[model samples]
Target: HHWGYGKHNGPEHWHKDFPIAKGERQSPVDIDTHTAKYDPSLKPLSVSYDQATSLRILNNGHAFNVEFDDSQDKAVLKGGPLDGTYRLIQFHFHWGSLDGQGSEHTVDKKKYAAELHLVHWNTKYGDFGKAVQQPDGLAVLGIFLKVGSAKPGLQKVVDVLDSIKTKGKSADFTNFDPRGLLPESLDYWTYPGSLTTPPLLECVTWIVLKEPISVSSEQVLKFRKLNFNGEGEPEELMVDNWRPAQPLKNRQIKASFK
Candidate 1:
């Protein structure tokens, strides 16, 4: 009954357990930039992040997340393909093993070293829990992370990993603005898809950025140090936590920029 990154419970075997894994709008689809339709009508993306909303970081067995205080509209995402305001809840990453191919979403059939997911819930949905079950409840911004020079903004996040190395661990991480990690360009491809994790709910409006951010090899290895196992259980490295690109069936990927 295990649903994890092991060979017996990996993505390929997910369909046997979670039927929604085969849903029409499954996420992490390969983005063929050349084939995507350009939509000049899409509004420019707007992001307002308040450092005070930065709460803490947690290791929830699947990945490490830097959570935010979403009780108010302090840190919010607006514009783009969304109809209403969405409040930022948390952000996390999916990375590969030593092979360095771990991003969930791919471009032109090419995989990156890692991927970041900034999860938000529509204000109309009340809260994140309720939003997760609604059709247009969630909006996730996907950013590709490639290997390069160390990102100064990311160093703060990496420094906290040591305190939450094991599953179910957490630490206070205040006054850290997540916006510093975003790329210069907000140009993206928008589509309807599902969460990449188990239960694989089809409740996400994905906005994948065209520009990618960079992290050094050291930082990538630090992410690898995370453990899927708890303090007592058998140890397992938290690597290759990515889902492969799903089929793009009867869906149109609209690009904000040509």
Candidate 2:
């Protein structure tokens, strides 16, 4: 009966709890390169992720997140469309129940098998809780996932899924550099959008990579094995944990490359 991917309390009903669900700047917009403006001044993204900074992996009911130690600027993100240094806090994924249906945002109306979200919060706001309320508080790097050859880096994360098969479960996960999963091209599209999840705060600066990272079909199907239910409850598959693409009203998406 809670906010889930079902017909009852899913995204269609999110506005009932968080009215901003239908507000301007909602995320996961359809990216059409034809209309995107090339911005020569957008600085190249700077990513510094220490393998040791990776803390643990947790199934937070909604999705599986690999948390990082952000107490200091050990793993930080700067440049791009960001105004100040943002600390890397966590990374999570959204997938469909099947192939070619999982990703939140799409390119030219095409949906990938999955999507990865690297979440960071601005240092200017002190902490993530406070930052979520500010206009320039969060920046999310989104990577689309396609079914192809196995991604060596992604296999490490996929191997740990069994340990966190149920919600509210966590396992020690370290020595993994998140940057290893990114594509060769840093080319991306940037726009102002909200978190794909609820309370649906309209604060995030979205940087969606144009090139997708490849994962084997076998690896992509493993995500569907994760459960949404916690221990002692009837298990529910953790697939389709993505929100549909929202409307793009008056905003313009800028391209970081030609």
Global lDDT scores for all candidate models:
0.91, 0.91
TM of each candidate vs. truth: 0.97, 0.97
- Candidate 1 per-residue lDDT, tens place, 9-71, comes to 899899888999999999889998888999888888888786338899999999999999999
lDDT score of residue 131 within candidate 1: 94
lDDT of 2 by residue, 115-181 (tens): 9999999999999999999988999999999998999999999999999999889999988889788
* Model 2: lDDT to the true structure: 0.91
| Regions of model 1 farther than 4 Å from truth | none
Residue 133 local lDDT, model 1: 84
